[PDB]
Symmetry: C4
Subunit: 359 residues, 4 copies
């Protein structure tokens, strides 16, 4: 019996091959930020109000004007079919059951179209990478619009891939039967048919395909390109958050890319308040990185995030029992968040306030 | 030979069945506050005065106008007959011998009447839960008044039960021969005859019986209902402490419910000063959570608590040697507190002052 | 080959019987201050000056107007003959060889007279306890004066003995052949012929013989009683240090009694600056507790101590090789202190200054 | 496959004899500063800018007016031929391949002339010790000038050698076939033919040969003696840095001598900002001590260092695979630094700024 999210990782290591487990598990380099994403949540202490009447705790909220069952949503984990045969399609179906949203990776092992077909009524957004080939980028955006995706989350922190040490020791790359389904060429589909040498296959993929020259000029282009809400994912500084708002973007996702890019950046829960402050109420702010418990969700919302995204636990759900496993992980987090809300005097998400936390 | 309180827990694990040991031992979720309740006491350092004449250290004080032999009293540990056949009755008899007070749990395995009969001359108070059925709540209050109980400690931090992970893995519930003796129905007596499913039997008990809508309106009701002193137990915030005083309550018990409710709240010794300050001398403040040593008692009193309550060590005393074991735990704490008082220059509790501590 | 002080303790445990090792090793209760006496020194960082000309580093200084070879002196460890047959006499002879001073315990296993005879030219002071019998106290002071002892260090932090847990488990008491040689009665000589029951023999000794009523009135008495310099040993507070100066005392020894009295007091190196400040240049301040390295000595002197005292390492020297072992421990500390002085730009003790340290 | 610098040390211990490994590995005394040199880098957190266009990250910079391929240079590790037969000559050839500079130890197992011959086009500087014999010191300076060395790094923190405990237990000294090649006498060449007794052979070497009277007067002499740039190596205080600038020196190398001199000084990354501030833009500041990763290099440069020096990793490269091993260590650091620069929004070293870091 798996009763908490920690239980799931424990189990996922027992079933996945090392290369696939290490890929999902890893942080960059010495993994300092990886540990900190978790340890940081513990440092923020909770100050619950008593006797507030919490009989019918309502977890419902909205992300970018769309209703969700809870401020807990699925983040864009790449290449989910390595964890479960059903991959991204199991994930979207779980999201459809939960009433929450799924961010789909540009590097998904299932296509934008496939995912919409498996979860037609699920809230779905696209995580976008900016490709050297702008026609490829445009195509992803257009396909997301066509298929009823409700926003673009542009990743802005990966001009190159971080150095995850296990992926290089393991010579990481997709199993022979799998591809990045959003692309048609061998190169852009991350075909395991290539010999990538003595390094991570993903680091090479990105170096070849993804544009390190990415700048605010590209943000201007993207903003003119789509009328969809656009969220900047990977922002860690207040002055960059200000710049995003100025470029007409509609949200910031505070993220250190699951501790997999630049190591030694702060925990997301630690930078969240500076971003919420920099944005001056203009745009919704979200958080990912280290969320494992309902109290983590409470802390991020007290500090001003609208919603949080869940990365690794989703993969671990997938690896345990596919769709049901993702559904169960999401239901564990939901009921932990409900209990934490109620114990802190919060009937609904609107009465969550920052007096609930102190560092 | 058991010579300190730590010795007792060590021993209690060796004799109790796992389910019963885990139930008493547990904190909520990842048990962060559990560890912190203890670690926090160590961070407050002592600044003893020398050459003060401490030849006849007097430990005597008062709780809510009633005299006690020492500012160390027994907190409301539920279902004591799981640790020792004599349960709550061994406890009250030890309290009678010591000259200190016992708070009786609403969820005791011995009745309010039984306990008064076993300790007629012992100082006794009732820890109250607010039940969905107000007639049940009223009955407990009336029975406490009838039986010579001298105050009501209302718990205000349990609209639902915290999630203690071991209790759910163990499917915790009372052994077949035991009940919550204050109640007559199967439901309200926590009859182990029920099949509680794949979770804690206690979490279900509370969800069914205990009113999550509890508010300050219920506090107003309770205050009109009894002329007994009422103490708010579970308060962790200064603004809530202020509210209690305003509702005409007679004390605050600073408690995080032994780290078993909302995890990630501060240690009680850490919030104590903010509560003492919020209350502005109007009402007595007590503390529970993490008290294991005489120096813990000294620290809480220097910071302004009138008295402290002892939870788990009492159960561990019970589990070692019943009445004698509880008596011995209380005598260990008494002599540790006496030694700590004397070494710090304090002849009596009235000259304990806050210059004795700094964080 | 033993080349540092840590090496000596390591070895002492291998040769001493457990009861004797535990007695010397122990702190009070959970031993928090014990660990902190050491860990605290590490937190103070050194800021060495370069290019100062340190060719002939002079370690010489003075304690209470008497010259010493180095600001490193022997503290009053009780009952040294438990570690080595030669006990206190080996110690004084080592001190005589080094040119530094020895503080003799009131609870020495060698008499005030014996020690003066074995080290006639050694600088010697008496550590005094105030006995219930004032004639006994007077006698110790008079014998120290008669025998060429140059100061009285009155201990002010032991109205009762701290609770050292191992001493109670071990039923600590002197081996059959040994006594506290400064006394003639069975009681006052700590005769092991007595059955002390289920506790520390030393805790009983003190409870029976040593006056818990000790106050500033007794300090006034002692000051009128002898024209010897008097130092208050055990002071941890600035307001008490002020009081000592006002009573006409000639020094303060910042001490938490080797972490063996009240546990949870600060490290001595941490309180030292507040005492140096409280004393306003009027009197010399010394430090004991946790000194194991030459850099510890440097730190205490930068913070304003005139000299430091060494407790446990002396016993460990005694236990390794008697007189030679104490001499070697003292020579290790001397050369470590010389090296640390030179590396920090300090030719002599007078140019040691507080810019050398920051916490 | 060795893919990070940590991998190299791990391997070096497996191949080197203990005495040689311990000598290179060691810090002074309890090795507190040793651990801290590393742990300190982790405490400084990175605040990367996004969307800055980092397509052609240029690592090129200059040290003291000479161009280097990257702000990462080789520090003056003594006696390299103990790690590899080719010693300093393998090192200079690797530096020649990399386009970066090598600081040559006064205590090199290869001569100033030998090194220039093996790396004629490599940027080379001399690390100078001030000898009791000033003719010896003058000779080293003159030989460096003659041989195309481009600066003098005078070490100012070794009036005596630190106490490295393993070197004394091991009776450290050069293997029979090796000498300090810059000297002709037995004494000054550190001939292993001598019996050095029961201590470090290097501590004796320094005590006999190196002048503990070193002062600012000697700095004045050295400044008049050569027109080469002079850098003060070993400075840890702002007031000393000020003094260096005043004596007409051309740089400061912030160093605690790899934690091998005075233990308990701060980490170099921690003192760096105070030195950069004390120097008021007048002179370039460098850092050594604890550099193992590209992010360490980024942090030192954000805090105002022009370049950093690498000590132990070079020896570990040497011990793994001689020239190729040193080259590979330097290439690992280069590509880690490039990745870290790019991920933080930095196209070139000139846009590295201090907003990138906070402690
Ligand atoms: C296996 C894995 C794959 C990921 N793939 C992507 C990706 O394709 N695009 C992206 O923007 N972020 C990616 N991320 C970062 C996540 O969107 C998210 O920030 C992170 O997983 C959240 O932290 P958590 O894993 O601790 O819950 C990935 C993270 C992991 C662990
Ligand atoms: C086994 C156990 C049962 C408890 N039962 C109750 C209860 O019935 N009602 C209540 O208000 N608090 C209850 N508490 C919380 C205690 O009143 C008290 O706050 C806590 O035990 C004090 O901390 P300590 O256990 O570290 O000494 C319980 C705690 C434990 C460990
Ligand atoms: C075995 C032992 C015996 C001691 N006996 C005495 C004593 O008789 N009188 C006294 O004032 N302090 C006594 N002390 C405290 C010391 O004077 C001193 O404060 C302490 O040993 C210094 O700390 P250190 O042991 O870490 O070096 C004793 C300490 C030890 C460890
Ligand atoms: C084996 C070894 C030998 C060293 N020899 C010298 C030396 O001869 N002269 C000098 O000024 N510093 C010497 N140092 C200190 C280095 O120049 C440098 O400050 C240090 O190695 C940098 O720290 P790192 O080893 O952590 O990279 C030595 C350090 C080591 C580890």
């Amino acid at each position: 019996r798996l009763i908490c999210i920690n239980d799931y990782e424990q189990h996922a290591k027992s079933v996945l091959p090392k290369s696939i487990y290490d890929y999902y598990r890893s942080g960059a380099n010495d993994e300092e930020t990886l540990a900190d994403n978790i340890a940081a949540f513990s440092r923020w202490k909770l100050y619950p109000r008593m006797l507030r009447n919490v009989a019918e705790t309502d977890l419902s909220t909205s992300v970018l004007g769309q209703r969700v069952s809870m401020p807990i949503c699925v983040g864009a984990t790449a290449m989910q079919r390595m964890a479960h045969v059903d991959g991204e399609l199991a994930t979207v179906r779980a999201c459809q059951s939960l009433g929450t949203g799924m961010m789909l990776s540009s590097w998904a092992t299932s296509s934008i179209e496939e995912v919409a077909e498996a979860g037609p009524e699920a809230l779905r957004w696209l995580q976008l990478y900016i490709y050297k080939d702008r026609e490829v980028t445009k195509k992803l955006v257009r396909q997301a619009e066509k298929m009823g995706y409700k926003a673009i989350f542009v990743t802005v922190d990966t001009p190159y891939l971080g150095n995850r040490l296990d992926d290089v020791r393991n010579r990481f790359k997709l199993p022979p039967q799998l591809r990045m389904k959003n692309f048609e060429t061998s190169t852009l589909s991350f075909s395991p048919e290539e010999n990538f040498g003595d390094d991570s296959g993903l680091a090479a993929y990105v170096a070849k395909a993804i544009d390190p020259s990415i700048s605010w000029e590209d943000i201007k282009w993207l903003r003119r390109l789509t009328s969809l809400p656009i969220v900047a994912k990977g922002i860690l500084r207040g002055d960059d958050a200000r710049e995003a708002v100025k470029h007409g973007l509609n949200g910031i996702l505070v993220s250190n890319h699951g501790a997999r890019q630049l190591d030694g950046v702060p925990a997301t829960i630690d930078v969240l308040p500076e971003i919420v402050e920099a944005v001056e109420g203009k745009v919704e702010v979200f958080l990912d990185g280290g969320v494992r418990k309902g109290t983590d969700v409470l802390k991020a919302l007290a500090l001003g995030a609208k919603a949080v995204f869940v990365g690794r636990p989703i993969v671990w759900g997938l690896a345990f029992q596919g769709e049901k496993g993702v559904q169960d992980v999401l239901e564990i987090l939901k009921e932990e968040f409900r209990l934490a809300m109620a114990l802190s005097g919060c009937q609904n998400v609107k009465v969550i306030d920052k007096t609930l936390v102190r560092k």
